[PDB]
Design a protein around this ligand. Structure first.
Ligand code: HEM
Ligand code: HEM
Ligand SMILES: CNCCN(C)c1cc(F)cc(CCc2cc(C)cc(N)n2)c1
Ligand SMILES: CNCCN(C)c1cc(F)cc(CCc2cc(C)cc(N)n2)c1
Ligand SMILES: CNCCN(C)c1cc(F)cc(CCc2cc(C)cc(N)n2)c1
Ligand SMILES: C[C@H](O)[C@H](O)[C@H]1CNc2nc(N)[nH]c(=O)c2N1
Ligand SMILES: C[C@H](O)[C@H](O)[C@H]1CNc2nc(N)[nH]c(=O)c2N1
Ligand SMILES: [Zn+2]
Lengths: 403, 404
C-alpha cells in the first residue's frame, strides 16, 4: 500500500511511491504519532550503503551498469575489505550533498536543490585550516548581497578518532549574555555557546547584536577560537517602509544563514563538519528570531510603539505587530539588496517543487509542521496540502554537541 | 528517562512523558517507515471487549472499580449481548461516554471545557419529525440568546437489522452554495453538494450568499425529509470592523452556533450515528478558514482592495494584513452582538492549561498538532512550541460515510 496524498484546496490526489525507498525508521508507530517532535530519541552494512549510493550516482549520469560503474563498485569493495572504510570521488561528493538537500523533509527552499556550490575541504588538518575554508565559504556565499547556496565539506569521521567539528550552530550567531538577574541580553538561543566562547578565552561585549567568534575543533584537540573579520559578516539594519520610528529600535539581522552543527551522511560516510548556507525566508527572522518569546521577544515593544491595545488578546495586537515586523525585514533586505524570499513566494515555489518531484521520483518527503510558515499558515498553499514524511539517504542529520 | 514518548515544550524547556497512549486500543495511520499525521482522513465477542472496556472506564471514573456493582454491571452487559447481540447504556453511562469522547478528540482545542457539556438523551426518538423537535430544542438551549452553552443530543444507536438515524447536513447551520452557469459558486462552496441534495428533495432554493439551508433528517429505513428552521432560532451576527467604517458595507455575516451533525459517536462498541454537538466558535474558524480559504468565501482580495493594499506582489504582505483585519472584525462583531466567541490567543492559552490538567489526571493528552495550532499567527501562540502525541482513545467521535 502506498499513501494517497490529497490537496484540499484543489481536490487533486497523488500517490507517494518514493517512500518505498526509505532507509531508516522515523519516530511513529501504528499505536501513536510522534511527528511533532523536533528531535529523535560494521563493514557489511557500510558496504551495502556504499553500493546503494554508488548505484544512485551512476544512475544520475545515465552511465549505470557500464564499465566505470563496475570498476567503481570494485574500488569500494577493495577499499572497505582492507581498511574497513572508503573515500568518495569529488564528483560523487557533489552529487551526494545535493541529494542530501533534496531529501531534507523540513526544507521549504528545495526548488533550489540542483544549484549548490560544493567546496571540498577534505584535505583539512587543523582548526586554522578550517578557518581558512570558512572564510572562503562566507565570502563566496554572501557575494555582496547576491547570495548563492554553498556547502563546505570537512574530512569524514574515522573509526579511530575524534571528529572535526564546528561548535557554533551557525557560522553567524549573536551573543546571549545571561545577566545577574536571569534576563538575557542578546539572543537567548546562544547563551551556552556564548559561555563556551568566553571560557575558551574570548573577551565578551555587551551589545544585543555582538557577532560571536567560532570555536573550531580538529580531532581530539581542544577547540580553538577564531574571530570573523567584520567586513566578511554582512548585516542589514531593520527599518519599516512607513513607520519612521522603527529604525530607532536599532534592530538588525545578518544576511547569511549558514548551518554548521549538522552531520552529512552519504553512502555510509559521515561528515560531522559540513557547514551549508542559502538565503533567509523572511519569517525566520521576522517571526521566529525576533518575536519568539524565548528569542528576542520584541512583540510588545513594537505593539506599544504602534500604540495598540496591549491589555487584551482580542485586539490582536500580537498579530498586528508581527505583520509589521515581517514587513520591516522584507523592506530592509530589499533596500540593502540582500537576497530574501517571503513566505508566500517560498511556499508557491515549494508547491512547484512537489510537482517536479512527483514526476521525477514518485513522491517527496515533507514535514508539514516545518513547511507551513509560523504566521498566516492557511493563507499559503502548503497548508492545504497533505504530505508524507520519511527519511531518505543521503541526508542531513542531527548529531550530539561535542562538549 | 522512562519507556513512553518524551514530550518537550521548546519555549519553556520542560519535559513530560505520555503514559496514556498505552491505553490506546486502536491504531492510527503512521508506521516506523513513514509519517501520515498531515492527512485529514487516514461483531459478537468483539463488542464484548469494547463494552467491558468502557464499563471498566465508567467504574474507575466513579471510583468503584472491582466492586460488586462493577462486576454485576459486566454480567448484565454480557447477558444482554449474549441473547440479543447488543446492549443498552444506563443514562449516566451515556453522559460519561459523551464527555469522554470530547475529552478524547485529538483535533479539538476547546477541551478545557470538556466536563461542562449538557447531554440530551433522545434515545427514544422515532420519526424524522421528532428528530426535528429535539434538534430545535438543542438549538434553543445551546444558543441561549447569545450566551452559548455546550450540548449534545443523542439519538437512537445503530441496531442490527434496522436502518440508521442520520442527519444528512454536516452542520445544523450551513449556508447554501449555488453552482453557477459560468462554473463559479454563489455562497459557500463547501455546501454545494448538500445544497443540490436539498433541492432534489424539493427545497425551493434562494440565490443569496448566506441562505440558511434546510435540514435533511432520516429516520430508520426512510427517505430523508426536509425541515426548514424557523429563522428566529438561527442567531446570526453581521460583520463590521471597529475602525474600518466600510467593512460593514460588505454585508458579510456568520451564524452564532457551530453544531456538527455528521459524526458518529462510539461508546463501548455502541454507535450513535446521529449525535449532533455544539460549542462556541474560535474566531479563526470564521475569520481565517471560512471567510479566507481560496476554496471557501475567498474574500481576502476584496478586503485588501478596499484597504488599498498592493495586491500585485506577495511581498507587500497584503494577504496577512487583510486576514488580520477580517479576524479582528469577527471578534469585534461577536463581542458587540454579545455572542460567545474565543480568540486564538485565549483559546490556545486555555488549551495549554488543559494539557497540564490532563497530564496530572491521566498521564497525557492525545493531540493533533497541525489542527491545534491556529491557521494565522501560529508561533505567536504557545501551542506552536509544544510537542504533542496523537493517538486514538475510545469513547470517540469518528467520521462515517455519507448516507447517499
Ligand atoms: C536557498 C535558500 C533556502 C531557503 C529559503 C531555505 C529555507 C528553509 C527553512 C525556512 C527551513 C526551516 C528552518 C527553521 O525553521 O529552523 C529549512 C530547513 C532546512 N533546510 Fe533549508 N533553505 C534554503 C537552502 C538550504 C540549503 C542550501 C540546504 C543545504 C544544502 C538546506 C537544508 C535544510 C535542512 C537540512 C533543513 C532542516 C533543518 C532541521 O532538521 O532542523 N536548505 N530550510
Ligand atoms: C466549546 C467550545 C469549543 C471550541 C472553541 C472548539 C474548538 C474546536 C476547533 C477550533 C476545532 C477544529 C475545527 C476545524 O478547524 O475543523 C475543533 C474540533 C473538534 N471539536 Fe471542538 N471545540 C469546542 C467544543 C466542542 C464540543 C462541545 C465537542 C463535542 C462534544 C467538540 C468536539 C470537537 C471534535 C470532535 C473536533 C474535531 C473533529 C474532526 O474534525 O476531526 N468540540 N474544536
Ligand atoms: C532551530 N532549528 C534547528 C537549528 N538547526 C540545526 C537548523 C537547521 C537548518 F537546516 C536550518 C535552520 C534555519 C536556518 C536556515 C538554513 C538555511 C540553509 C537556509 C535558511 N533559509 N535558513 C536551523
Ligand atoms: C436506559 N437503558 C437501560 C438501563 N439499563 C442498563 C438496563 C435496563 C434494564 F431494564 C435491564 C438491564 C439489564 C440487561 C437487559 C436484559 C434484557 C432481557 C433486556 C434489556 N433491555 N436489558 C439494563
Ligand atoms: C474536516 N472536518 C470539518 C467538518 N467536521 C466534521 C467538523 C467536525 C468538528 F468536530 C468540528 C468542526 C469545526 C466546527 C466546530 C464545532 C464545535 C462543536 C465547536 C467549534 N468551535 N467549531 C468541523
Ligand atoms: C513543537 C513543534 O513541532 C516545534 O515548535 C516546531 C514546529 N514547526 C517548526 N517549523 C519550522 N520551520 N521551524 C521550527 O523551528 C519549528 N518548530
Ligand atoms: C493538509 C492539512 O493537514 C489540512 O489542510 C489540515 C491542516 N490543519 C487544520 N487545522 C484545523 N484546525 N482545521 C483544518 O481543517 C485543518 N486542515
Ligand atoms: Zn506520524
Amino acid at each position: 500500500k502506498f499513501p494517497r496524498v490529497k490537496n484540499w484546496e484543489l481536490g487533486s490526489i497523488t500517490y507517494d511511491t518514493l517512500c518505498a525507498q526509505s532507509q531508516q525508521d522515523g519516530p511513529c508507530t501504528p499505536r501513536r504519532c510522534l511527528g511533532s517532535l523536533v528531535l529523535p530519541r560494521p563493514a557489511e552494512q557500510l558496504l551495502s550503503q556504499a553500493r546503494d549510493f554508488i548505484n544512485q550516482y551512476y544512475s544520475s549520469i545515465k552511465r549505470s551498469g557500464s564499465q566505470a560503474h563496475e570498476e567503481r563498485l570494485q574500488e569500494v569493495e577493495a577499499e572497505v575489505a582492507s581498511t574497513g572504510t572508503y573515500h568518495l570521488r569529488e564528483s560523487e561528493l557533489v552529487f551526494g550533498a545535493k541529494q542530501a538537500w533534496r531529501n531534507a523533509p523540513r526544507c521549504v527552499g528545495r526548488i533550489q536543490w540542483g544549484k549548490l556550490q560544493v567546496f571540498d575541504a577534505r584535505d583539512c588538518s587543523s582548526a586554522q585550516e578550517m578557518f581558512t575554508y570558512i572564510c572562503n565559504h562566507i565570502k563566496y556565499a554572501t557575494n555582496r548581497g547576491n547570495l548563492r547556496s554553498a556547502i563546505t565539506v570537512f574530512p569524514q569521521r574515522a573509526p579511530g578518532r575524534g571528529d572535526f567539528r564546528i561548535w557554533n550552530s551557525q557560522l553567524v550567531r549573536y551573543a546571549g549574555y545571561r545577566q545577574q538577574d536571569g534576563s538575557v541580553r542578546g539572543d537567548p538561543a546562544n547563551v551556552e555557546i556564548t559561555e563556551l566562547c568566553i571560557q575558551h578565552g574570548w573577551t565578551p561585549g555587551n551589545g544585543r547584536f555582538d557577532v560571536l567568534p567560532l570555536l573550531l575543533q580538529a580531532p581530539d584537540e581542544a577547540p580553538e577560537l577564531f574571530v570573523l573579520p567584520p567586513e566578511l559578516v554582512l548585516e542589514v539594519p531593520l527599518e519599516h517602509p512607513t513607520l519612521e520610528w522603527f529604525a530607532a529600535l536599532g534592530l538588525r539581522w545578518y544576511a547569511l544563514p549558514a548551518v554548521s552543527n549538522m552531520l552529512l551522511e552519504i553512502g555510509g560516510l559521515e561528515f560531522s563538519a559540513a557547514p551549508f548556507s542559502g538565503w533567509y525566508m523572511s519569517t525566520e527572522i521576522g517571526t521566529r528570531n525576533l518575536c519568539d518569546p524565548h528569542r528576542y521577544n520584541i512583540l510588545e515593544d513594537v505593539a506599544v510603539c504602534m500604540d495598540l491595545d496591549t491589555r487584551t488578546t482580542s485586539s490582536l495586537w500580537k498579530d498586528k505587530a508581527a505583520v509589521e515586523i515581517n514587513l520591516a525585514v522584507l523592506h530592509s533586505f530589499q533596500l540593502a539588496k540582500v537576497t530574501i524570499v517571503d513566505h508566500h513566494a517560498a511556499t508557491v515555489s515549494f508547491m512547484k517543487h512537489l510537482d517536479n518531484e512527483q514526476k521525477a521520483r514518485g513522491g517527496c518527503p515533507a514535514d508539514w509542521a516545518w513547511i507551513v510558515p509560523p504566521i498566516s499558515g492557511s493563507l499559503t498553499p502548503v497548508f492545504h496540502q497533505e504530505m508524507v514524511n520519511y527519511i531518505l539517504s543521503p541526508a542531513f542529520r542531527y548529531q550530539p554537541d561535542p562538549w
